[PDB]
Design a binder for this molecule. Structure first.
Ligand SMILES: [Mg+2]
Ligand SMILES: [Zn+2]
Ligand SMILES: [Zn+2]
Ligand SMILES: [Zn+2]
Ligand SMILES: [Zn+2]
Lengths: 46, 115, 67, 404, 51, 1131, 206
RNA sequence: AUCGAGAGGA
């Protein structure tokens, strides 16, 4: 539900809800990245 | 996309026989042994051991396709002998040779580590 | 980007030799003598150490995504 | 299925094939059927069409199948023949001194589909049983076809003197009753020319037997080449010191000859020949001198080659290359031409700023006096790039007009 | 005069010395995508039911 | 003092390194853009005329100064912030800076009631900025600073970012201007034609071409005519001379013939005089010109005025466009006639169209200047209309509202975004191919694309002359790097030390010539021109001189001292014809060369010493140029230069070739470009092989850029383990191939092993591939945005639901989050959903518009980025990561044109092995060598064996007499190997020795972008096109393969009629129509009610069913659209 | 959070040799194990958890691969040669993973290949003439050659057969070289024994 | 999705 994103410039973990302009609350940077999922991906070391 | 799993070279598929014997009708006393999930490693030794049998008239093997994982070994023997018997004796002789080689390598290692 | 683990040809481990190789090079070894000190006698493993470009050192000049 | 490659130039560019399902993600082709398609494996892609009815399937099976497509009506000869590795290897295999042991022979007989299961009596019984390569190719050869050919190295004055029917060089291919009685097989015997073994097999034996003949040659010869091996390296591009000295003396004499012709022209001691202006006559004389130099040096390199040379092996079999390629790799690359003439004066009375004005010498106008192993000098490199650009332009510009 | 067609495939070509001249080695994915409409009969009822 | 030969190979390369420390590889792009911003924009703004508008009050609106700030970005709140190029790439912004112009509006009504109002910094537009230029935020930043900004320090720059897309301007070739070129067309009414594309110094109009031709023989003799601009009829030259005020025949021939002792010229000009005797005064000649024109005024007064304006403005603008210049124009037109007569008399050679001394490279600066002139003119026009509609009402107006800045901004942005070079409305007159998307597949591809030249001759043209490698490309263009497709010879590449001149003003040179003993052209008498030497400057004949030799000595001294003459100024003395042509204009490709004294280099050992400590004493390339030791020579000045290929040529020989050299090559290998400079031993290959490698180095995988982790490129391939080549050239040190290599050193054996490498194929080692050999990662970026364009319909990212969404595929959307975006680390297969987008309807009130994966990919989501685009709705980029392990069908290549696909992969026990158990990584077929003659491949393999056994990097620089095959073989025999690189190998299957000793060793191989998995495609009854119900086109569209005309012809030859019908009817577009048996026109069928009737014939019983292709039905209907009646008569 | 993607790290971990001397004979193939995905009878658990907090680059090496089984550890970590480098980390970067090691051989993947080169040779002096040197004088002598330096190759042996094969089996680290040879002989013998068992079933079923 | 342009492959 929270969908916490990371700032491209300040690297801050901040929560943003839908219908919200994409803005970091710590520095106002406009580019955000999603965090790595918690799902379990498996690799054959090959 | 089309890469077979690497175990398919070694593992038998369900309902697939490791070895199949088919009588060769062109000449008498000849057989084709289609061995699945083996390659040149066993084919070459089985062929070369069969060539040591004076009752074997023909001994050859082929991997019909490298992407496929079977070998065919053709064995023709003299009429008083059998290709199945020749193949069995070749495997027995290879096993005895490898057992002797293993024991002698153990002895050589023991000598080398000791003195 | 990083030193391979095995030699592509023989499968000898070269992953543990990059740092030692660099340390020997700053010790005023020639590349050949350095490769001899690490025990890379086949020219395949000498190829592995001698032709490696450590790009990871340049990729570590960028700040990560998370602090 | 119909298997197609673009551009579809003739009827052999779309042939019927039987599907064989195999692991990876490429269309796997036999190597004889690459010449009809003009296909090589440098990233070429091909189109598979699957007929969707029994009527179309029967149509393709009875009209467009590859064995029915072996001989082309264009030039009444085979369209597919034996090709690179199989041709170099069959040349090496049918040499007179190829002796196979019992285990090797059985290994090769495993790859004959059309084998009656009878091991042939070896050509040598004592001191040790040995079969010959001709003795196994005789098993590969189908039916009872009869064929006379001549290996590419067949001397022209041998059919006159003695030894016509017992050739010292093992040239003069003779197949009788489907046994290779003698001779070294090559492009002339297994290629796409008229009257070759593959053609005579298709004409006497059916298309099915000829299909099996192609397949059996390829399988047996490739599995023997696993023993023999074929390669090429720097040692094949090298010549002995005597050959290098001969080639350099030839080039020096040729350059002095061109200097003499230049001096004659400069002193008005050169008179034109009928049908040409003085410039054209001077150009003819210089080009004749330099072509003579190139041919003499190429002959020197060719005679320097050993029987183990792999360039000579591939050229002799006809698998790939030509004697001019050997000459350019060993002796001299030669004259570079743009539009059929020497390098033009693109600067003001100069080919490059490195030359004096009005220099009609061989090096000024684009004669590469080095080989590819020796390496080209910068001006030779640029002139050679000009000559090669001409070929690239021709290849890229002729296509539209020829297709139209 | 020319048009796009169904039941066609295209991929890179590769050598295979172990095919006959009249054979073409096809990937299992091309062959799994492409289909041939075979009519049912008592001769092939069992095989086609298996498929 | 002198550099001895033993030190030369160091000294020269030291010099070369200094060059690349000063300039780089994209210097031409940056210098062009810098000149455009510093000078061209200001010149364009000032060269526009003040717009005087009045009903009464009047306003002039003079533009006087420009200001270009740094690149900034304005958010929705409007806060200006400095925008970094990476932010522009990520957010799909345009890396542009605002251009503000100072405007001065003075009110003048009456009674000396004057007052000026100056609007400082009026925002006139936005100009996109070339990266790493002076006006780029990445200017002067250190590598640490660039890495702080997520930029690659090795990134050369030289490109623009328009809408997040990296666009590179390709230099465009064009014939040089203001120069007289006498050609001779074989099929034409004229025997000889002397053309001159004339253009004023500061461009304001297109090139006005003037021709001066000679009519082909067959009234009495050969007549000279002149095809003036804006006039559709030939005009005799004598008429033009009289129209300029020279009526007496003596005066005209004084201007044309400078040596009256030459009757040949005289009799060849006599027909033109004999043809113009009825016209003998200036006004009558002007009337004749106006009458021959395409707008013949009924009254001779306006005819004469029009002829005056044409002869003053359109005829030879470079000579001068003001009044009282008729003397200069007459002298120049007489020079054109003189050149034509010299060509017709055989005293001069016809000019070569292909000579690069006759060509100019239109770079980013002069191209953006063309755009800016057009766009500023349109802007001033719009301002004129806006201000006129206000002053017509007799009231003031606000210039800020008159200036609609979208003209300049959107114009430059559109032109750089699409490549259509011109106004957006003239989208067909505009010339495309300028401004291409920068190639980011490998660092070599990026560098080469940034150093790319284009000959706009047209690919359709089948004349080989412009495609030929001209002699004059030496040192300026790579002899090898060129596409081998339909653009052979047209698309070119700069040589490594090639520098395109940026341009300069001829004012200091002209002033010095005035102070020097040159005599102006208006002050002389024509009798002096006979023995004197003409002096042209940028095509304009400015005067004459008496001792050209010491003039040239003075000018060369001045240029070598960095005095008034700058380094890029070309100064050609033609001696046989007494011209001295000086060029300062832009677009002249030139290269640096070492000047030579009597028979010695001026580059002494002290210069090499100071260059060795380049990083301490700041002694750089520019100090080498300022010392008079190096000189930039252009293509046209090379004609007058005598080069030494090496200082060895300057040695006194048993027979001296020249003994009067003037320059020397820094190194001959600098004739190659970026991609040809990676080939080792390119002088041992056939040249087509070098061209094919120069093309294939650009598809090679590597690390295209260091900061690839942050770039959201549409397609990107990164190699796991790039290696620098063991065998390298000394030019890759400057290409940065060692820092971003694009291949791996592979133990390659040239052998025939199992037959799976025949016909340009390779056998790879499966065990090596398992160890990461030539493994790569493929990054694919998908973009999406939710548009709120209007309240009618709005898109939004949100996890769709089966109960509300309508066009929702059966694929599962569980991998998406509540935000509608998949998360990184999630494994995604073909047809999966990565972005859940829903659009509100006018399965209710919202429809599914989700973004699926490009089918049959099967990657893992690498990362997800969310931001806002320019207008400001939510914008997403998702990078998916797919590991590409090499397999059968993947294309690999060496650096010698030796390409091939993987035929098969054998494990290490199946591959052949040496006595010391080394198996080849790759096995290639020996038959790929002989016809191709890629001996560089073999020498590289042998050198690489020596390098690997010795612990060094082999030197494969092209022309190096210190490295030949015998030395390499002797070196290899010292490491216990056969001197020729052969080894005894054993059969991997049986272990028996191979009879033929195999040639094996390290060779640098490349993995090319062309993987089979991106090419394999199949179809069986997929989607069809809308217009003609035939299979789609492409893998991406699940389309069908084209059964073309040639396939139809092949199957006709086969005689396969049912297969032909299956392919062209039943497998493409089967269809049925109903035809009236009477009129043969398609009837109306109603199969539900079974009522078939033809409205034409008014029958409903004689209808027939016809099975025809849908394309044929569509054809017949499109013919009926044309009033054609194709009646399908079934009887 | 490292600069190498996940498959890069996984591939790199797969190629680290693990001491397999006495444990490989005891463990089962996961095909043969009657357990779920994993169990201690067919697999070995590894854990790696590294975080670069300090300013210098942190070398995540094979020493950071912590195992549940003390017998199966990375070779370099065994109690000189440095540790194999898995990844370099910058301050703030972190790598935490959980691996499982299995039993396999080189037919399936080269990571299960125990050799770092198998030199194999026979007939060092070309007496059987299985090679044909165009210029026998140009070739260096084998380390196993017994020829005086004037002699380039041995006189041709018409009655000869390949005997006396020379081996140099170099170990990657997982097994001892003599354990590689002994396990090779045992594996080949069990391949032949299984083949003979299936052969007997086919003969008796006919 | 369409259209165009460009870059490529054989
Ligand atoms: Mg091809
Ligand atoms: Zn922030
Ligand atoms: Zn190695
Ligand atoms: Zn009708
Ligand atoms: Zn288990």
């Amino acid at each position: 539900q929270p969908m916490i994103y990371i700032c491209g410039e300040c690297h801050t973990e901040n929560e943003i809800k839908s219908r919200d302009p994409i803005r970091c609350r710590e520095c106002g940077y406009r580019i955000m990245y999603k965090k790595r999922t918690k799902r379990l991906v498996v690799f054959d070391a090959r | 996309m089309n890469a077979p799993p690497a175990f398919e070279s070694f593992l038998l598929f369900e309902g697939e026989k490791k070895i199949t014997i088919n009588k060769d009708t062109k000449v008498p006393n000849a057989c084709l042994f289609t061995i699945n999930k083996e390659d040149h490693t066993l084919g070459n030794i089985i062929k070369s051991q069969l060539l040591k049998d004076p009752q074997v008239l023909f001994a050859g093997y082929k991997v019909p396709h490298p992407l496929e994982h079977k070998i065919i070994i053709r064995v023709q023997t003299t009429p008083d002998y059998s290709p199945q018997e020749a193949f069995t004796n070749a495997i027995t002789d290879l096993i005895s040779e490898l057992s002797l080689l293993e024991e002698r390598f153990r002895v050589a290692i023991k000598d080398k580590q000791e003195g | 980007m990083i030193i391979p683990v095995r030699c592509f040809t023989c499968g000898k481990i070269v992953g543990n030799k990059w740092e030692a190789y660099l340390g020997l090079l700053q010790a005023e070894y020639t590349e050949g003598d350095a490769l001899d000190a690490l025990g890379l006698k086949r020219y395949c493993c000498r190829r592995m150490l001698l032709a490696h470009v450590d790009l990871i050192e340049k990729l570590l000049n960028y700040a990560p995504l998370e602090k | 299925v119909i298997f197609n490659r673009q551009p579809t130039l003739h009827k052999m560019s779309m042939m019927g094939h039987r599907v064989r399902i195999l692991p990876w993600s490429t269309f796997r082709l036999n190597l004889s059927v690459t010449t009809p398609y003009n296909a090589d494996f440098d990233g070429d892609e091909m189109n598979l069409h699957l007929p969707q009815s029994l009527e179309t399937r029967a149509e393709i099976q009875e009209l467009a199948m590859v064995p029915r497509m072996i001989v082309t009506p264009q030039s009444n000869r085979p369209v597919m023949g034996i090709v690179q590795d199989t041709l170099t290897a069959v040349r090496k295999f049918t040499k007179r001194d190829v002796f196979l042991e019992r285990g090797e022979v059985m290994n090769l007989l495993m790859f004959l589909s059309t084998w009656d299961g009878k091991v042939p009596q070896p050509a040598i019984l004592k001191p040790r049983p040995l079969w010959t390569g001709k003795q196994i190719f005789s098993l590969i050869i189908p039916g009872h076809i009869n064929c006379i050919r001549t290996h590419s190295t067949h001397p022209d004055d041998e059919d006159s003197g003695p030894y016509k029917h017992i050739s010292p060089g093992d040239t003069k291919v003779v197949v009788e009753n489907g046994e290779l009685i003698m001779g070294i097989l090559c492009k002339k015997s297994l290629g796409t020319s008229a009257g070759s073994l593959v053609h005579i097999s298709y004409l006497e034996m059916g298309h099915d037997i000829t299909r099996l003949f192609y397949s059996n040659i390829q399988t047996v010869i490739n599995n023997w080449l696993l023993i023999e091996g074929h390669t090429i390296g720097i040692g094949d591009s090298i010549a002995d010191s005597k050959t290098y000295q001969d080639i350099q003396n030839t080039i020096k004499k040729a350059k002095q000859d061109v200097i003499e012709v230049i001096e004659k022209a400069h002193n008005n001691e050169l008179e034109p020949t009928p049908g040409n202006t003085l410039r054209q006559t001077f150009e003819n004389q210089v080009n004749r001198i330099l072509n003579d130099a190139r041919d003499k040096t190429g002959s020197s390199a060719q005679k320097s080659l050993s029987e183990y040379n792999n360039f000579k092996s591939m050229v002799v079999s006809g698998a790939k290359g030509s004697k001019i390629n050997i000459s350019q790799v060993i002796a001299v690359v030669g004259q570079q031409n743009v539009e059929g003439k020497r390098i033009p004066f693109g600067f003001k009375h100069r080919t490059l700023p490195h030359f004096i004005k009005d220099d009609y010498g061989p090096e000024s106008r684009g004669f590469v006096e080095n080989s590819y192993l020796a390496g080209l000098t910068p001006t030779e490199f640029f002139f050679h790039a000009m000559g090669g650009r001409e070929g690239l332009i021709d290849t890229a510009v002729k296509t539209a007009e020829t297709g139209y | 005069m020319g048009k796009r067609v169904d039941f066609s495939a295209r991929t890179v070509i590769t050598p295979d010395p172990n095919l006959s001249i009249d054979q073409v080695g096809v990937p299992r994915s091309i062959a799994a995508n492409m289909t041939f409409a075979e009519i049912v009969t008592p001769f092939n009822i069992d095989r086609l039911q298996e498929l | 003092d002198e550099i001895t030969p033993d030190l030369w190979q160091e000294a020269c390369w030291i010099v070369i390194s200094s060059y690349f420390d000063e300039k780089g590889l994209v210097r031409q792009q940056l210098d062009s853009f810098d000149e455009f911003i510093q000078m061209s924009v200001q010149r364009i703004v000032e060269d526009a005329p003040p717009i005087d508008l009045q009903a009464p009050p009047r306003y002039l609106l003079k533009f006087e100064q420009i200001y270009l700030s740094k690149p900034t970005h304005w958010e929705r709140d409007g806060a200006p912030s400095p925008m970094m190029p990476n932010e522009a790439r990520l957010r799909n912004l345009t890396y542009s800076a605002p251009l503000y112009v100072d405007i001065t509006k003075t009110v003048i009504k009456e009674g000396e009631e004057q007052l000026q109002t100056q609007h400082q910094k009026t925002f006139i537009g936005k100009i996109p900025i070339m990266l790493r230029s002076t006006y780029c935020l990445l200017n002067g930043l250190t590598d640490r600073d660039l890495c702080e900004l997520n930029e690659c320090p090795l990134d050369p720059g030289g490109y623009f970012i328009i809408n997040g897309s990296e666009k590179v301007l390709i230099a465009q070739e064009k014939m040089a201007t203001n120069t007289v070129y006498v050609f001779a067309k074989k099929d034409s009414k004229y025997a000889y034609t002397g053309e001159c594309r004339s253009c004023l110094e500061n461009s304001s109009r297109p090139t006005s071409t003037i021709w001066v031709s000679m009519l082909a023989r067959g009234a009495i003799g050969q007549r000279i005519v002149a095809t003036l601009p804006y006039i559709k009829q030939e005009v005799p030259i004598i008429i033009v001379f009289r129209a300029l005020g020279f009526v007496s025949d003596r005066d005209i021939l004084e201007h044309i013939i400078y040596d009256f002792e030459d009757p040949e010229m005289m009799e060849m000009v006599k027909p033109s005089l004999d043809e113009a005797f009825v016209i003998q005064e200036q006004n009558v000649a002007l009337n004749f010109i106006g009458s021959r024109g395409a707008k013949p005024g009924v009254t001779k007064e306006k005819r004469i005025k029009y002829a005056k304006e044409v002869l003053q403005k359109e005829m030879l603008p470079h000579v001068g466009v003001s009044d009282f210049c008729e003397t200069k124009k007459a002298y120049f037109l007489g020079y054109m006639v003189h050149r034509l007569l010299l060509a017709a008399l055989g005293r001069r050679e016809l000019d070569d169209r292909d000579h690069y001394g006759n060509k100019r490279l239109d770079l980013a600066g002069p191209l953006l200047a063309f755009l800016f002139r057009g766009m500023f003119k349109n802007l001033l026009k719009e301002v004129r209309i806006y201000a006129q509609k206000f002053i017509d009402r007799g009231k003031d107006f606000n210039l800020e509202l008159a200036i609609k800045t979208r003209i300049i901004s959107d114009g430059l942005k559109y032109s750089l975004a699409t490549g259509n070079w011109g106004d957006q409305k003239k989208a067909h007159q505009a010339r495309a191919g300028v401004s291409q998307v920068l190639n980011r597949l490998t660092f070599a591809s990026t560098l080469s694309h940034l150093r790319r030249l284009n000959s706009p001759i047209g690919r359709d043209g089948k004349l080989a002359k412009p495609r030929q490698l001209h002699n004059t490309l030496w040192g300026m263009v790579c002899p090898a790097e060129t596409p081998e497709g339909h653009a052979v010879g047209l698309v070119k590449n700069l040589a490594l030390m090639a520098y395109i001149s940026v341009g300069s003003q001829p004012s200091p040179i002209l002033e010095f010539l005035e102070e020097w003993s040159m005599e102006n052209l208006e002050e002389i008498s024509p009798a002096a021109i006979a023995d004197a030497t003409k002096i042209f400057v940028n095509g304009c004949w400015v005067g004459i001189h008496k001792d050209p030799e010491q003039l040239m000595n003075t000018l060369r001294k001045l240029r070598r001292q960095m005095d008034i003459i700058v380094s890029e100024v070309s100064m050609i003395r033609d001696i046989r014809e007494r011209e001295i042509r000086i060029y300062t204009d832009a677009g002249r490709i030139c290269r640096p060369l070492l000047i030579v004294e009597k028979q010695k280099l001026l580059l002494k050992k002290r210069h090499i010493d100071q260059l060795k400590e380049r990083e301490y004493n700041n002694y750089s390339w520019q100090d080498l140029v300022a010392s008079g030791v190096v000189e930039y020579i252009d293509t046209l000045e090379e004609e007058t230069v005598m080069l030494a290929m090496t200082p060895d040529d300057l040695q006194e020989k048993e027979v001296a070739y020249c003994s009067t050299y003037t320059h020397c090559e820094i190194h001959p290998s600098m004739i190659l470009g970026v991609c040809a400079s990676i080939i080792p031993f390119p002088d041992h290959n056939q040249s087509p092989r070098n061209t094919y490698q120069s093309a294939m180095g650009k598809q090679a995988m590597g690390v295209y850029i260091t900061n690839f982790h942050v770039r959201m490129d549409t397609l990107a391939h990164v190699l796991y383990y790039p290696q620098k080549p063991l065998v390298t050239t000394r030019s890759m040190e400057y290409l940065r191939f060692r820092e971003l290599p694009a291949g791996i050193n592979s133990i390659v054996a040239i052998a025939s092993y199992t037959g799976y490498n025949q016909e340009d194929s390779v056998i790879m080692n499966r065990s090596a591939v398992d160890r990461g050999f030539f493994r790569s990662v493929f990054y694919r970026s998908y973009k999406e945005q939710e548009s709120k364009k209007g309240f009618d319909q709005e898109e939004v990212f949100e996890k769709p639901t089966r109960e509300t969404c309508q066009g929702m595929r059966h694929a599962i959307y569980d991998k998406l989050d509540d935000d509608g975006l998949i998360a990184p680390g999630v494994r995604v297969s073909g047809d999966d959903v990565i972005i859940g987008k829903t659009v509100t309807l006018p399965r209710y009130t919202k429809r599914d518009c989700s973004t699926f994966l490009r089918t049959s990919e099967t990657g893992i989501v690498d990362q997800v980025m969310v931001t806002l685009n320019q207008e400001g709705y939510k914008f997403c980029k998702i990078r998916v990561r797919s590991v590409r392990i090499p397999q059968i069908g993947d294309k690999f290549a060496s650096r010698h044109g030796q390409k091939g696909t993987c035929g098969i992969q054998y494990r290490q026990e199946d591959m052949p092995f040496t006595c010391e158990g080394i198996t080849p990584d790759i096995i290639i077929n020996p038959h790929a060598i002989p016809s191709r003659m890629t001996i560089g491949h073999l020498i590289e393999c042998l050198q690489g064996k020596v390098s690997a056994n010795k612990g060094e990097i082999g030197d494969a620089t092209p022309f190096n007499d210190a490295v030949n095959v015998q030395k390499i073989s002797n070196l290899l025999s010292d490491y216990g190997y056969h001197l020729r690189g052969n080894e005894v190998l054993y059969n991997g299957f049986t272990g028996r020795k191979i009879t033929s000793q195999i040639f094996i060793g390290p060779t640098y191989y490349q993995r090319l972008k062309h993987m089979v998995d991106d090419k394999i495609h199949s179809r069986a009854r997929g989607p069809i096109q809308i217009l003609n119900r035939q299979p789609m086109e492409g893998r991406s569209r699940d389309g069908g393969l084209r059964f073309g005309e040639m396939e139809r012809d092949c199957q006709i030859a086969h005689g396969a009629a049912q297969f032909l019908r299956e392919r062209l009817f039943e497998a493409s577009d089967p269809y049925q129509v109903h035809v009236c048996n009477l009129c043969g026109i398609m009837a109306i069928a109603n199969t539900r009610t079974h009522t078939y009737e033809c409205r034409g014939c008014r029958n409903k019983t004689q209808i027939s069913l016809v099975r025809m292709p849908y394309a044929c039905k569509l054809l017949f209907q499109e013919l009926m659209s044309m009033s054609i009646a194709p009646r399908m008569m079934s009887v | 959070s490292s600069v190498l993607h996940d498959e890069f790290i996984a591939h790199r971990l797969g190629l680290i040799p693990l001491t397999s001397d006495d444990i490989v004979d005891k463990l089962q193939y996961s095909r043969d194990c009657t357990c779920e995905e994993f169990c201690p009878e067919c697999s070995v658990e590894f854990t790696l958890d590294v975080r670069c907090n300090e300013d210098q680059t942190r070398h995540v090496t094979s020493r950071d691969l912590i195992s549940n089984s003390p017998r199966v550890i990375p070779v370099t970590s065994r109690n000189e040669q440095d540790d194999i480098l898995i990844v370099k980390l910058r301050k703030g970067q972190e790598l935490r993973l959980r691996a499982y090691a299995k039993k396999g051989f080189g037919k399936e993947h080269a990571k299960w290949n125990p050799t770092a080169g198998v030199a194999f040779e026979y007939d060092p002096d070309n007496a059987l003439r299985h090679t044909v040197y165009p210029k026998p004088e140009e070739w260096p002598k084998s380390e196993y050659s017994e020829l005086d330096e004037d002699e380039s190759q041995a006189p041709y042996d018409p009655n000869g057969k390949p005997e006396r094969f020379y081996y140099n089996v170099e170990s990657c680290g997982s097994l001892r070289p003599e354990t590689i040879v002994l396990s090779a002989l045992s594996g080949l013998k069990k391949k032949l024994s299984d083949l003979q068992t299936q052969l007997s079933h086919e003969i008796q079923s006919d």
